[PDB]
Short mmCIF file of C-alpha atoms and ligand atoms in Angstrom, two decimals:
data_model
loop_
_atom_site.label_atom_id
_atom_site.label_comp_id
_atom_site.label_asym_id
_atom_site.label_seq_id
_atom_site.Cartn_x
_atom_site.Cartn_y
_atom_site.Cartn_z
CA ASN A 1 22.16 53.57 -174.23
CA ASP A 2 19.44 51.64 -176.17
CA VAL A 3 21.85 48.74 -176.01
CA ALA A 4 22.99 49.11 -172.35
CA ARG A 5 19.35 49.26 -171.30
CA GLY A 6 18.89 45.71 -172.59
CA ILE A 7 22.18 44.50 -171.03
CA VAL A 8 21.58 45.71 -167.45
CA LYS A 9 17.93 44.78 -167.94
CA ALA A 10 16.68 48.35 -167.52
CA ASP A 11 14.21 47.22 -170.19
CA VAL A 12 12.49 44.58 -168.01
CA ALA A 13 12.16 47.09 -165.14
CA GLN A 14 10.54 49.37 -167.68
CA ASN A 15 8.29 47.00 -169.59
CA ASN A 16 7.19 44.48 -166.84
CA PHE A 17 7.51 46.65 -163.74
CA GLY A 18 6.64 50.09 -165.20
CA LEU A 19 9.88 51.56 -163.81
CA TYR A 20 11.25 54.58 -165.61
CA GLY A 21 12.02 56.30 -162.30
CA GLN A 22 9.17 58.74 -161.90
CA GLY A 23 9.30 60.48 -158.52
CA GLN A 24 13.05 60.08 -158.15
CA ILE A 25 15.46 62.98 -158.45
CA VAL A 26 18.97 62.15 -159.67
CA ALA A 27 21.73 64.79 -159.26
CA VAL A 28 24.71 64.68 -161.60
CA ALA A 29 28.07 66.44 -161.04
CA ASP A 30 30.00 66.85 -164.25
CA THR A 31 31.32 69.47 -166.69
CA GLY A 32 28.01 71.10 -167.65
CA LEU A 33 24.72 70.57 -169.40
CA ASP A 34 24.43 71.47 -173.08
CA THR A 35 23.62 75.18 -173.45
CA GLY A 36 23.64 75.88 -169.72
CA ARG A 37 20.17 77.53 -169.78
CA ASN A 38 17.21 75.79 -168.17
CA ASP A 39 14.74 77.18 -170.72
CA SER A 40 13.76 76.34 -174.37
CA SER A 41 17.40 76.14 -175.60
CA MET A 42 18.31 73.07 -173.47
CA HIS A 43 18.90 69.78 -175.33
CA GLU A 44 15.63 67.86 -175.90
CA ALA A 45 16.77 65.00 -173.52
CA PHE A 46 16.62 67.32 -170.46
CA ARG A 47 14.29 70.23 -171.48
CA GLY A 48 11.60 70.64 -168.78
CA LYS A 49 12.90 68.08 -166.25
CA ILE A 50 15.70 70.07 -164.63
CA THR A 51 14.85 70.51 -160.97
CA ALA A 52 17.93 72.70 -160.60
CA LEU A 53 20.95 73.74 -162.69
CA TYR A 54 23.87 75.15 -160.68
CA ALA A 55 26.95 76.74 -162.11
CA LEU A 56 29.69 75.92 -159.64
CA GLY A 57 32.95 76.28 -161.63
CA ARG A 58 32.45 79.33 -163.93
CA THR A 59 30.18 82.17 -162.79
CA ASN A 60 26.65 82.23 -164.29
CA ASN A 61 27.87 79.55 -166.83
CA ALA A 62 26.90 75.85 -166.70
CA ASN A 63 27.28 75.13 -170.41
CA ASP A 64 29.06 72.13 -171.90
CA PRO A 65 31.83 72.98 -174.44
CA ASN A 66 33.50 69.72 -173.38
CA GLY A 67 30.68 67.19 -173.87
CA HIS A 68 31.32 64.93 -170.87
CA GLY A 69 28.45 65.90 -168.56
CA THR A 70 25.70 66.16 -171.16
CA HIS A 71 26.49 62.62 -172.33
CA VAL A 72 26.71 61.27 -168.81
CA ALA A 73 23.46 62.96 -167.84
CA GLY A 74 21.75 61.61 -170.93
CA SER A 75 22.56 58.09 -169.82
CA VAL A 76 20.98 58.78 -166.44
CA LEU A 77 17.57 60.14 -167.44
CA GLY A 78 17.58 61.52 -171.00
CA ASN A 79 13.97 61.36 -172.27
CA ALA A 80 13.94 62.30 -175.96
CA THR A 81 15.64 59.43 -177.89
CA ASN A 82 18.57 57.24 -176.91
CA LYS A 83 16.98 57.62 -173.48
CA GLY A 84 18.77 57.10 -170.16
CA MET A 85 17.77 54.22 -167.94
CA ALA A 86 15.49 56.34 -165.76
CA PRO A 87 13.80 58.63 -168.31
CA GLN A 88 11.11 59.83 -165.86
CA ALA A 89 13.41 61.02 -163.05
CA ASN A 90 14.23 64.69 -162.71
CA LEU A 91 17.62 66.26 -162.78
CA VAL A 92 19.71 68.32 -160.48
CA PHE A 93 22.90 69.36 -162.28
CA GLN A 94 26.04 70.81 -160.69
CA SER A 95 28.44 72.18 -163.29
CA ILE A 96 31.93 71.90 -161.83
CA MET A 97 34.07 72.59 -164.89
CA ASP A 98 36.03 75.87 -164.71
CA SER A 99 37.31 78.39 -167.22
CA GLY A 100 40.31 76.15 -168.19
CA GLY A 101 38.73 72.69 -168.62
CA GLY A 102 39.33 71.62 -165.02
CA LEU A 103 36.86 70.56 -162.33
CA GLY A 104 37.68 73.56 -160.21
CA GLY A 105 34.13 74.19 -158.99
CA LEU A 106 34.19 71.20 -156.66
CA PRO A 107 34.21 72.51 -153.08
CA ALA A 108 37.07 71.62 -150.71
CA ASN A 109 34.55 69.81 -148.54
CA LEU A 110 32.51 67.56 -150.78
CA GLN A 111 29.63 67.41 -148.25
CA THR A 112 28.76 70.97 -149.35
CA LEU A 113 28.14 69.57 -152.84
CA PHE A 114 25.99 66.60 -151.79
CA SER A 115 23.88 68.78 -149.43
CA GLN A 116 23.34 71.30 -152.16
CA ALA A 117 21.75 68.46 -154.18
CA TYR A 118 19.93 66.77 -151.28
CA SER A 119 18.18 70.10 -150.61
CA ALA A 120 17.02 70.25 -154.32
CA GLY A 121 15.22 66.98 -153.79
CA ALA A 122 17.98 64.57 -154.95
CA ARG A 123 18.47 61.23 -153.19
CA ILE A 124 21.03 59.76 -155.62
CA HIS A 125 24.29 61.62 -156.65
CA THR A 126 26.39 60.41 -159.60
CA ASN A 127 29.99 61.44 -160.24
CA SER A 128 31.92 60.51 -163.40
CA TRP A 129 35.23 61.91 -162.23
CA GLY A 130 38.18 61.10 -160.06
CA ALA A 131 41.82 61.70 -159.23
CA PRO A 132 44.02 58.78 -160.40
CA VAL A 133 45.52 58.17 -156.92
CA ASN A 134 45.84 54.40 -157.37
CA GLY A 135 43.55 53.25 -154.58
CA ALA A 136 44.31 55.72 -151.79
CA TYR A 137 41.52 56.74 -149.45
CA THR A 138 41.45 60.50 -149.47
CA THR A 139 39.87 63.35 -147.63
CA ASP A 140 37.38 63.46 -150.51
CA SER A 141 36.80 59.66 -150.05
CA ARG A 142 36.36 60.38 -146.33
CA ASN A 143 33.85 63.24 -146.79
CA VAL A 144 31.93 60.96 -149.14
CA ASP A 145 31.69 58.29 -146.43
CA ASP A 146 30.69 60.69 -143.67
CA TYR A 147 27.90 62.16 -145.82
CA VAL A 148 26.29 58.78 -146.62
CA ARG A 149 26.27 57.45 -143.04
CA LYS A 150 24.55 60.69 -141.96
CA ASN A 151 22.11 61.21 -144.88
CA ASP A 152 19.92 59.09 -147.16
CA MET A 153 21.88 59.82 -150.35
CA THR A 154 23.10 57.03 -152.57
CA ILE A 155 26.41 58.31 -154.02
CA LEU A 156 28.09 56.83 -157.13
CA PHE A 157 31.64 57.14 -158.47
CA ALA A 158 33.34 55.85 -161.56
CA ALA A 159 36.23 53.54 -160.88
CA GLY A 160 38.52 55.41 -163.28
CA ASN A 161 40.21 54.83 -166.69
CA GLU A 162 43.72 53.55 -165.70
CA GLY A 163 43.17 49.85 -166.21
CA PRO A 164 43.85 47.14 -166.90
CA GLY A 165 46.50 47.20 -164.19
CA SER A 166 45.47 46.46 -160.62
CA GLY A 167 45.54 48.99 -157.79
CA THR A 168 44.32 51.63 -160.23
CA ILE A 169 40.99 52.67 -158.68
CA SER A 170 40.63 56.44 -158.54
CA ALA A 171 39.41 58.56 -155.60
CA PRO A 172 36.86 59.38 -154.52
CA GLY A 173 36.01 55.99 -156.12
CA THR A 174 37.85 54.45 -153.13
CA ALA A 175 35.19 55.48 -150.60
CA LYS A 176 33.49 52.68 -148.59
CA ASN A 177 29.91 53.96 -148.84
CA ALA A 178 29.84 54.92 -152.47
CA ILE A 179 28.75 52.54 -155.21
CA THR A 180 31.81 52.51 -157.50
CA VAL A 181 31.35 51.52 -161.17
CA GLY A 182 33.80 50.04 -163.69
CA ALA A 183 32.88 49.38 -167.35
CA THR A 184 32.02 46.21 -169.26
CA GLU A 185 31.55 46.34 -173.05
CA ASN A 186 28.32 47.54 -174.69
CA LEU A 187 27.21 45.22 -177.48
CA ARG A 188 27.78 47.09 -180.77
CA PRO A 189 30.12 44.62 -182.54
CA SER A 190 30.47 46.85 -185.63
CA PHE A 191 32.81 49.06 -183.51
CA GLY A 192 34.15 46.34 -182.77
CA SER A 193 36.54 44.81 -180.18
CA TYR A 194 35.85 47.39 -177.45
CA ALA A 195 32.14 46.31 -177.89
CA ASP A 196 31.62 42.67 -179.01
CA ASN A 197 31.16 40.74 -175.72
CA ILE A 198 28.97 41.93 -172.84
CA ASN A 199 31.16 39.78 -170.50
CA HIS A 200 34.35 41.53 -171.50
CA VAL A 201 35.75 43.96 -168.88
CA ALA A 202 37.07 47.06 -170.70
CA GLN A 203 40.83 47.59 -170.92
CA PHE A 204 40.77 51.09 -169.42
CA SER A 205 38.43 50.12 -166.53
CA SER A 206 40.45 50.73 -163.38
CA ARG A 207 40.94 47.66 -161.37
CA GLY A 208 40.98 46.77 -157.69
CA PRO A 209 41.83 46.38 -155.03
CA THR A 210 42.17 49.67 -153.26
CA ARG A 211 45.34 50.36 -151.24
CA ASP A 212 43.98 48.55 -148.15
CA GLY A 213 42.96 45.55 -150.24
CA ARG A 214 39.21 46.07 -150.50
CA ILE A 215 37.10 45.10 -153.51
CA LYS A 216 36.43 48.16 -155.70
CA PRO A 217 34.69 48.61 -158.08
CA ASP A 218 31.52 47.28 -156.59
CA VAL A 219 29.67 46.52 -159.87
CA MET A 220 29.99 46.81 -163.69
CA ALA A 221 28.12 48.14 -166.64
CA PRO A 222 28.42 48.74 -170.37
CA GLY A 223 30.46 51.88 -170.89
CA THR A 224 32.13 51.43 -174.27
CA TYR A 225 30.46 52.99 -177.35
CA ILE A 226 27.51 54.40 -175.47
CA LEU A 227 25.17 56.48 -177.61
CA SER A 228 23.88 59.36 -175.49
CA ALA A 229 23.04 63.08 -175.66
CA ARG A 230 25.56 65.20 -177.58
CA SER A 231 26.22 68.75 -176.47
CA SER A 232 25.47 71.53 -178.99
CA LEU A 233 28.76 73.04 -177.88
CA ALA A 234 30.97 69.93 -177.80
CA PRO A 235 33.31 69.21 -180.78
CA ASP A 236 33.84 65.82 -182.43
CA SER A 237 37.04 65.20 -180.40
CA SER A 238 35.25 64.67 -177.09
CA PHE A 239 33.54 61.60 -178.66
CA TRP A 240 34.44 58.04 -179.72
CA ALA A 241 32.25 58.24 -182.82
CA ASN A 242 29.75 60.56 -184.46
CA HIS A 243 26.10 59.78 -184.90
CA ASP A 244 24.02 63.03 -185.46
CA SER A 245 23.74 66.62 -184.09
CA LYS A 246 21.98 65.65 -180.85
CA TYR A 247 23.65 62.28 -180.06
CA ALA A 248 27.10 60.72 -180.17
CA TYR A 249 29.32 57.96 -178.84
CA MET A 250 31.57 57.96 -175.73
CA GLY A 251 33.33 55.22 -173.80
CA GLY A 252 34.62 55.21 -170.21
CA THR A 253 33.86 54.20 -166.66
CA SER A 254 32.19 57.67 -166.83
CA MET A 255 29.61 56.15 -169.22
CA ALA A 256 29.04 53.00 -167.13
CA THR A 257 28.50 55.04 -163.93
CA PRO A 258 25.35 56.98 -164.99
CA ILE A 259 23.78 53.79 -166.34
CA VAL A 260 24.00 52.37 -162.83
CA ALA A 261 22.82 55.69 -161.37
CA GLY A 262 19.70 55.55 -163.57
CA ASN A 263 19.28 51.89 -162.55
CA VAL A 264 19.24 53.04 -158.94
CA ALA A 265 16.53 55.58 -159.62
CA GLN A 266 14.54 52.67 -161.08
CA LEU A 267 15.48 50.36 -158.20
CA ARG A 268 14.60 53.10 -155.67
CA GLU A 269 11.24 53.90 -157.32
CA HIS A 270 10.31 50.20 -157.01
CA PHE A 271 11.11 50.01 -153.29
CA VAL A 272 9.15 53.16 -152.40
CA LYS A 273 6.19 52.45 -154.73
CA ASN A 274 5.87 48.70 -154.86
CA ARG A 275 7.45 47.62 -151.58
CA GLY A 276 6.45 50.25 -149.04
CA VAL A 277 9.97 51.25 -147.97
CA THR A 278 12.45 53.99 -148.70
CA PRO A 279 15.64 51.99 -149.21
CA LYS A 280 18.75 53.31 -147.56
CA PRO A 281 21.89 53.60 -149.66
CA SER A 282 23.10 50.29 -148.09
CA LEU A 283 20.15 48.28 -149.32
CA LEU A 284 20.34 49.92 -152.78
CA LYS A 285 23.98 48.82 -153.00
CA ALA A 286 23.27 45.33 -151.63
CA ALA A 287 20.46 44.67 -154.10
CA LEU A 288 22.66 45.69 -157.09
CA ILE A 289 25.44 43.41 -155.83
CA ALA A 290 23.27 40.34 -155.06
CA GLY A 291 21.59 40.70 -158.46
CA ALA A 292 24.81 41.30 -160.44
CA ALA A 293 26.28 38.98 -163.11
CA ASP A 294 29.49 36.98 -162.96
CA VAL A 295 31.03 37.78 -166.37
CA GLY A 296 33.15 34.64 -165.91
CA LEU A 297 36.19 35.90 -163.97
CA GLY A 298 34.81 34.65 -160.65
CA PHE A 299 35.07 36.11 -157.17
CA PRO A 300 36.49 37.80 -155.43
CA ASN A 301 37.96 39.83 -158.28
CA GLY A 302 39.19 43.40 -158.70
CA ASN A 303 38.53 43.48 -162.44
CA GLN A 304 34.73 42.97 -162.39
CA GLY A 305 34.07 43.58 -158.69
CA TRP A 306 30.81 41.75 -157.78
CA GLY A 307 29.70 41.64 -161.42
CA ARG A 308 27.72 43.39 -164.10
CA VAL A 309 24.44 44.95 -163.03
CA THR A 310 21.35 42.86 -163.64
CA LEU A 311 18.43 45.02 -162.60
CA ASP A 312 15.44 42.63 -162.76
CA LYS A 313 17.25 40.39 -160.29
CA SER A 314 17.87 43.28 -157.88
CA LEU A 315 14.15 44.39 -157.95
CA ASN A 316 12.52 41.58 -155.88
CA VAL A 317 15.22 40.87 -153.30
CA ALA A 318 14.34 39.68 -149.77
CA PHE A 319 15.77 42.42 -147.51
CA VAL A 320 16.77 43.98 -144.35
CA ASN A 321 16.80 47.75 -144.62
CA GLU A 322 19.07 48.89 -141.77
CA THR A 323 16.38 47.96 -139.15
CA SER A 324 18.81 46.01 -136.90
CA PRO A 325 21.38 48.12 -135.03
CA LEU A 326 24.43 46.35 -133.66
CA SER A 327 27.01 47.07 -130.97
CA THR A 328 30.15 44.88 -130.50
CA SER A 329 29.45 41.17 -129.71
CA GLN A 330 25.65 41.19 -130.44
CA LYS A 331 24.21 39.49 -133.55
CA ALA A 332 21.08 39.56 -135.75
CA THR A 333 19.73 36.21 -136.87
CA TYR A 334 17.38 35.36 -139.75
CA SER A 335 16.18 32.22 -141.48
CA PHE A 336 15.73 31.76 -145.23
CA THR A 337 14.48 28.59 -146.95
CA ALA A 338 16.25 27.78 -150.19
CA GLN A 339 15.13 25.58 -153.02
CA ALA A 340 17.63 23.28 -154.73
CA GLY A 341 18.23 24.10 -158.38
CA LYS A 342 18.67 27.90 -158.24
CA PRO A 343 21.65 29.91 -156.94
CA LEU A 344 21.18 31.64 -153.56
CA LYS A 345 22.96 35.03 -153.21
CA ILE A 346 23.32 36.93 -149.86
CA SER A 347 24.95 40.37 -149.76
CA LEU A 348 25.62 42.13 -146.49
CA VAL A 349 26.29 45.86 -146.92
CA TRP A 350 26.85 48.65 -144.35
CA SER A 351 27.49 52.44 -144.43
CA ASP A 352 30.62 52.46 -142.39
CA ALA A 353 31.80 55.32 -140.23
CA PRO A 354 34.46 57.17 -142.21
CA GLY A 355 38.03 55.96 -141.98
CA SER A 356 41.31 57.79 -141.77
CA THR A 357 43.46 58.83 -144.76
CA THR A 358 46.51 57.37 -143.10
CA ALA A 359 45.52 54.15 -141.41
CA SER A 360 46.53 50.71 -142.62
CA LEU A 361 42.84 49.80 -143.19
CA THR A 362 39.91 52.10 -143.80
CA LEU A 363 37.34 49.79 -142.18
CA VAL A 364 36.00 51.07 -138.82
CA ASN A 365 32.97 48.93 -137.83
CA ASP A 366 33.57 45.23 -138.61
CA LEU A 367 30.43 43.10 -139.30
CA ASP A 368 30.68 39.42 -140.30
CA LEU A 369 28.13 37.56 -142.40
CA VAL A 370 27.76 33.92 -141.44
CA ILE A 371 25.58 31.49 -143.32
CA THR A 372 24.70 27.96 -142.04
CA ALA A 373 23.23 25.39 -144.56
CA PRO A 374 20.62 22.71 -143.55
CA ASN A 375 23.39 20.04 -143.26
CA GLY A 376 25.73 22.08 -141.03
CA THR A 377 28.07 23.54 -143.68
CA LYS A 378 29.26 27.06 -142.92
CA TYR A 379 30.13 29.98 -145.12
CA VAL A 380 31.63 33.30 -143.99
CA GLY A 381 31.43 36.51 -145.99
CA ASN A 382 33.65 36.71 -149.11
CA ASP A 383 35.33 33.34 -148.51
CA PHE A 384 35.26 31.57 -151.91
CA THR A 385 38.03 28.96 -151.23
CA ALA A 386 36.82 25.59 -149.81
CA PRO A 387 36.04 25.15 -147.04
CA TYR A 388 34.16 28.44 -146.98
CA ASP A 389 34.37 29.17 -143.25
CA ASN A 390 38.08 29.71 -142.36
CA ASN A 391 38.80 33.04 -144.05
CA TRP A 392 37.11 35.86 -142.12
CA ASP A 393 36.82 39.34 -143.74
CA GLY A 394 38.25 42.38 -141.91
CA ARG A 395 38.66 44.91 -144.73
CA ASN A 396 35.31 45.20 -146.50
CA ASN A 397 31.96 46.81 -145.71
CA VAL A 398 30.47 44.45 -148.25
CA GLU A 399 30.24 40.71 -147.30
CA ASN A 400 28.86 38.11 -149.78
CA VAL A 401 28.04 34.42 -149.74
CA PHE A 402 26.96 33.03 -153.15
CA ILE A 403 26.03 29.33 -153.67
CA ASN A 404 25.64 27.82 -157.20
CA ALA A 405 23.55 24.83 -156.11
CA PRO A 406 22.15 25.23 -152.58
CA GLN A 407 20.27 22.59 -150.52
CA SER A 408 16.48 22.35 -150.24
CA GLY A 409 16.04 23.48 -146.64
CA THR A 410 16.40 26.42 -144.31
CA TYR A 411 19.56 28.47 -144.27
CA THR A 412 20.45 30.60 -141.28
CA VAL A 413 21.78 34.07 -142.16
CA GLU A 414 23.57 35.72 -139.21
CA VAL A 415 25.30 39.12 -139.10
CA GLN A 416 27.85 39.30 -136.26
CA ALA A 417 29.18 42.50 -134.67
CA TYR A 418 32.88 41.56 -134.41
CA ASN A 419 34.19 44.97 -133.46
CA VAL A 420 31.97 48.01 -133.67
CA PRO A 421 34.02 50.93 -132.38
CA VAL A 422 31.78 53.73 -133.68
CA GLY A 423 28.40 52.09 -133.05
CA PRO A 424 25.76 51.00 -133.07
CA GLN A 425 25.99 50.05 -136.78
CA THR A 426 22.97 49.34 -138.96
CA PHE A 427 23.34 47.08 -142.06
CA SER A 428 21.34 45.97 -145.06
CA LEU A 429 20.89 42.51 -146.56
CA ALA A 430 19.79 41.51 -149.99
CA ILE A 431 18.99 37.94 -150.91
CA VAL A 432 18.33 36.59 -154.35
CA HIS A 433 16.98 33.11 -154.78
CA1 LIG B 501 35.98 42.83 -176.51
CA1 LIG B 502 33.90 41.49 -141.50
CA1 LIG B 503 38.37 29.40 -146.89
#
């Protein structure tokens, strides 16, 4: 965690912006949380900052004999040592592990889980778990998408651990409106090959696209050899490597995911406190994406998604925060003046109505991003083959135009309502220059 903080730049948010995520409540849904008592016996990382602790899977028991959820949760907001990215956020925990090691305390309708947390104050919900369904869009993926479009919860899912083969993304990681996280390498070279290059996508990281050919995961993060809170009840075999009695090493898209959840608590605190707006889930996703780092595989790409989180870049984005509704055939139009010499990144993100588990494509409302340079050159969203205006996107509820070396001059940024069956549809934009 001390290392991932520096990679995703959670350190610059913290030292130069003062962002440790105070005021933000992050809910985690995993196995359990150390001793399972929200009193003096709770692991130092979490003691006194648990807004609520719910036992969902075993009755009156939210303890962690496994190890998974304590470690995950540490990476979010742990605030003793080896601190999570948002050490000043408070914690809602839903323990879903049952009496046999399964996640049997998840409700049939996942909206019941997110509303439980939303009512405890939580506005971000992080889930290091999935069913290895190789990219299918499930009922669970559908209840995830419904919930977000209706409620201001940013919901995160790990991509899964069935890489490096493509079409391996796990549900509900396949949901449109979730931020889905795969793992790059932490930088602890003494471990060594699973952690010696921050630009290296991890073997196990599940890879895109989903069944209908969308880009998942959305972003990346260190999630090999992550030092985080160690459960007093977990044995050595749940970990990659020992460290001491209160901290230990794990690796997984499950370790990457809570880093990005913490980075959203930090990103969210900054919007509300320093920018006068509560960012919708769509903006929060767009800002991560616009700010994220090409590891060197290029775009589009199912292995890295839109890149490896880079938090300082996401903090001061120019934005639209869902303030422009759109019905079919209308358009919203904005101007942005670019300087030559720096890249210009524009991410269009919407919270799409939920799709069907059985359609050819999950997309429902189709918005099109359309950029127009000073000199008349045109880019459409996600078209990275020259010329950049002949390949229109009809699968994705993310649309990106990224230019290495833009012109000095005004760019037009237009979002077009191509076909908006369940409208009107709001959208966010994030621009990094
Ligand atoms: Ca490596
Ligand atoms: Ca489109
Ligand atoms: Ca093209």
